[PDB]
Amino acid sequence: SKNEDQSTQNTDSQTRTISKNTSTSRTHTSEVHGNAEVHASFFDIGGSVSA
Amino acid sequence: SKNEDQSTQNTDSQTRTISKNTSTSRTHTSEVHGNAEVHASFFDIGGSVSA
């Protein structure tokens, strides 16, 4: 007779997790735009520079 | 008589987890715009190039 001791375990688990969260955020944005423009017509030519 | 030993376990667990978090972020944005334009009228036609 093999003197071996064996065991089986069954387990059930039901978990209810109720969670809260909150947040704020603060953004500070800078920006530097550029522009150039060359216009041309039959007899009218222009140019423009912007920032 | 079956020499088998069985056991049942019941367990209750209440966990209160209070969590803190903080953050910073730093964004650096570049941008290169383009533009072309063709205008046409009864007798007036123009064109424009921008960047």
Structural contact between residues A16 and B28, judged by C-beta atoms closer than 8 angstroms: no
Q: Which residues of B touch A36 (CB under 8 A)?
A: 50-51
Structural contact between residues B48 and B35, judged by C-beta atoms closer than 8 angstroms: yes
Technique behind this structure? cryo-EM
Q: Point out the residue among A34, A37, A41 whose CB comes nearest to the CB of B45.
A: A41
Alpha-carbon distance of A51 to A37, in angstroms, equals 12
Q: On the CB side of A10, how many CA atoms lie within 13 Å of its CA?
A: 1
CA angle A26, A31, A36 (to 5 degrees): 165
Spatial strand order in the sheet of B45-50: A45-50, A35-40, B45-50, B35-40
- In a mutational test of the B interface, the residue from A26, A39, A44 whose CB has the highest number of chain B CBs within 10 Å is A39
Distance of CA B48 to the CA centre of its chain: 38
Type of residue numbered A4: E
Residue B11: count of CB within 10 angstroms of its CB: 5
What the block records as the tokens of B17 is: 């987890």
What the block records as the tokens of A22 is: 């909150």
Alpha-carbon distance of B41 to A44, in angstroms, equals 14
**Three-state secondary structure call for residue A50:** strand
